Design a protein around this ligand. Structure first.
Ligand SMILES: [Hg+2]
Ligand SMILES: [Hg+2]
Length: 83
């Protein structure tokens, strides 16, 4: 009964998908469970980072056990297909 807002941009599509997810943290594996289609993707998430000239970078996450970065109180991902 406690939550973070997860939203991702999927394989190009410019309107993103948003949805509520339960529990103070989210991991890449939890995130991967939201995806509707199967296959091989790379996963990037918006994240603030002081060593880049305009603040943000999209961090790649590979391991399901990882905690996903948070940005402006949301989780924001780009999901990209390995062509
Ligand atoms: Hg609770
Ligand atoms: Hg796709």
């Amino acid at each position: 009964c406690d939550s973070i807002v997860v939203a991702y941009y999927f394989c190009g599509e410019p309107i993103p998908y948003e949805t509520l997810v339960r529990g103070r943290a989210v991991t890449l594996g939890q995130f991967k469970e939201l995806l509707t289609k199967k296959g091989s993707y790379r996963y990037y998430f918006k994240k603030v980072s002081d060593e880049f000239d305009c603040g943000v970078v999209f961090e790649e996450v590979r391991e399901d056990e990882a905690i996903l970065p948070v940005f402006e109180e949301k989780i924001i991902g780009k999901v990209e297909k390995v062509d």
